[PDB]
From Swiss-Prot:
The protein's name in its UniProt record: Large ribosomal subunit protein uL30
Family: Belongs to the universal ribosomal protein uL30 family.
Database matches in InterPro entries: Ribo_uL30_ferredoxin-like_sf, Ribosomal_uL30_bac-type, Ribosomal_uL30_CS, Ribosomal_uL30_ferredoxin-like
Higher taxonomy: Bacteria, Thermotogati, Deinococcota, Deinococci, Thermales
UniProt KW keywords: Ribonucleoprotein, Ribosomal protein
Gene behind this protein: rpmD
UniProt xrefs under NCBIfam families: rpmD_bact
Any one of the GO CC terms: cytosolic large ribosomal subunit
Pfam families: Ribosomal_L30
Listed SUPFAM superfamilies: Ribosomal protein L30p/L7e (SSF55129)
Origin: domain of life: Bacteria
GO biological process, one term: translation
Length: 57
RNA sequence: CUGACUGGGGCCUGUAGAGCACUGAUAGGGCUAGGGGGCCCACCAGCCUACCAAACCCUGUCAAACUCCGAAGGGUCCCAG
């Protein structure tokens, strides 16, 4: 499982990166979600790597 | 539950780059159809050129409307989140 925390604001970033955060359920700064490590989920995690911090739990 | 976005799979494309196979452009040399003069000689032709220049050969380049090539990506469909 992956633990993903939103640490940088998506203001000013392209709409596809905003949509990737919505697909992951990250809506607030510093919000923390535990998601399953599957390629479909992981693909969106990589897309917004510069905005989030990822840990394995 | 079909959405943005994402994962896998197939198909579509001629840009970036690159290249000279086509079309044009183009540097140096070699070889020479044909040019300027020329030893001339019109009875008849070769030859002389550190003056041009067709093709050809070597070396060396350029291109939005060149392409023997050709990505990253993008588009679309199917299945999955
Ligand atoms: K669904
Ligand atoms: K050419
Ligand atoms: K595809
Ligand atoms: Mg920011
Ligand atoms: Mg905004
Ligand atoms: Mg920004
Ligand atoms: Mg900003
Ligand atoms: Mg916030
Ligand atoms: Mg180019
Ligand atoms: Mg090429
Ligand atoms: Mg040119
Ligand atoms: Mg030449
Ligand atoms: Mg070129
Ligand atoms: Mg160019
Ligand atoms: Mg070129
Ligand atoms: Mg053309
Ligand atoms: Mg081209
Ligand atoms: Mg579905």
């Amino acid at each position: 499982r992956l633990k993903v925390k939103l640490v940088k604001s998506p203001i000013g970033y392209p709409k596809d990166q905003k949509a990737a955060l919505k697909a992951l359920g990250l809506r607030r700064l510093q919000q923390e979600r535990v998601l399953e490590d599957t390629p479909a989920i992981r693909g969106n995690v990589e897309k917004v790597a510069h905005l989030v911090r990822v840990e394995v739990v």
